[PDB]
Amino acid sequence: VYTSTETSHIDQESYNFFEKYARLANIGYCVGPGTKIFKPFNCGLQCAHFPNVELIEEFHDPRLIFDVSGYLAVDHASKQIYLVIRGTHSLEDVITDIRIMQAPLTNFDLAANISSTATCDDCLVHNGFIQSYNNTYNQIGPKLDSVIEQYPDYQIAVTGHSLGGAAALLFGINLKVNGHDPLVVTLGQPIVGNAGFANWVDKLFFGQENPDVSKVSKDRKLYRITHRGDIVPQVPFWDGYQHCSGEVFIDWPLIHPPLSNVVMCQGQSNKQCSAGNTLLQQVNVIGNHLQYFVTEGVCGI
Numbered sequence: 444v445y446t447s448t449e450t451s452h453i454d455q456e457s458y459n460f461f462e463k464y465a466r467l468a469n470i471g472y473c474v475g476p477g478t479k480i481f482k483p484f485n486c487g488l489q490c491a492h493f494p495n496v497e498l499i500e501e502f503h504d505p506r507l508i509f510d511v512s513g514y515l516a517v518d519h520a521s522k523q524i525y526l527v528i529r530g531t532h533s534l535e536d537v538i539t540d541i542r543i544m545q546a547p548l549t550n551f552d553l554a555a556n557i558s559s560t561a562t563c564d565d566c567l568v569h570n571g572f573i574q575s576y577n578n579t580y581n582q583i584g585p586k587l588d589s590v591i592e593q594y595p596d597y598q599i600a601v602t603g604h605s606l607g608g609a610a611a612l613l614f615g616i617n618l619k620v621n622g623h624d625p626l627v628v629t630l631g632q633p634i635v636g637n638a639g640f641a642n643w644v645d646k647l648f649f650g651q652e653n654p655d656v657s658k659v660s661k662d663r664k665l666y667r668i669t670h671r672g673d674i675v676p677q678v679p680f681w682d683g684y685q686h687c688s689g690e691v692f693i694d695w696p697l698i699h700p701p702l703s704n705v706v707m708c709q710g711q712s713n714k715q716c717s718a719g720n721t722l723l724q725q726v727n728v729i730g731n732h733l734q735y736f737v738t739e740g741v742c743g744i
């Protein structure tokens with residue numbers, strides 16, 4: 444596994460870009476029962492930061508513990524199509540499953556829209572996260588394709604928090620091997636697959652193994668935002684699992700971190716970042732997993 448302790452600071456434009464995706468991910472918690480996103484795109488404070496955005500479709504499946512909910516929208520101001528995904532089930536229930544239950548690792552080429560030749564032969568991923576990816580594809584994939592055809596020069600951006608972040612990573616990989624050029628930003632994302640998968644994802648997105656991911660740049664298309672004290676990005680840890688590169692770490696205990704305290708981390712594990720979370724920092728598992736620029740997991744704040 445490529446390890447490092449190198450980190451780099453960011454500028455305010457990059458901080459505002461990460462905050463943006465944190466907000467869009469938060470809005471994913473406005474989909475489901477008891478909540479709503481009103482057309483065009485109204486859902487209280489967080490949707491109010493998105494003029495000229497129209498909700499296309501929401502989706503919600505509660506059938507299985509790894510099923511997903513979320514929405515598809517088009518932002519005519521930024522010329523982007525947004526796919527935003529979350530886990531349908533409570534964060535407590537989902538994280539308990541990921542933390543404690545041992546998935547058999549499955550080849551990503553078994554997932555929807557992935558051809559037998561698109562992945563490396565050793566590209567293995569947690570069977571639950573494949574289900575989250577599949578469940579996203581089966582609910583929204585055809586609608587996303589029709590919207591891509593309708594707005595063919597808009598940039599596709601996939602984002603999600605928690606299990607949504609795992610589904611987003613895989614859905615971005617689906618779009619990328621299938622000829623699109625998506626932006627993928629995940630928050631609080633658990634480790635998806637093994638060393639084969641992680642290194643293949645780094646080649647796919649950064650163009651080499653052990654990529655220099657110290658910079659935010661117009662052409663970079665993968666960011667994994669993590670927060671001090673959140674253990675979700677540290678599980679599952681069954682040896683075998685490892686992250687791809689691309690970590691952006693909020694080294695701050697609260698929402699709304701100072702600019703100095705969001706850093707770009709080198710490597711697939713970095714003790715200056717998530718891998719260095721101390722035992723006292725890890726204690727409050729759900730609360731620390733919500734603190735990503737804005738509070739994630741609750742609609743309307």
Ligand SMILES: *[C@@H]1O[C@H](CO)[C@@H](O)[C@H](O)[C@H]1NC(C)=O
Nearest residue numbers: 553554555556573574577581
């Ligand atoms: C994913 O969904 C497709 C239907 O689009 C199905 O063919 C496939 O077997 C599913 N894969 C897994 C691992 O569930």
Ligand SMILES: *[C@@H]1O[C@H](CO)[C@@H](O)[C@H](O)[C@H]1NC(C)=O
Nearest residue numbers: 556584585587588617618621
């Ligand atoms: C599925 O793959 C096809 C064939 O490459 C691609 O054209 C299409 O956009 C993909 N659809 C989704 C929703 O990923």
Ligand SMILES: [K+]
Nearest residue numbers: 634635686687
């Ligand atoms: K990963």
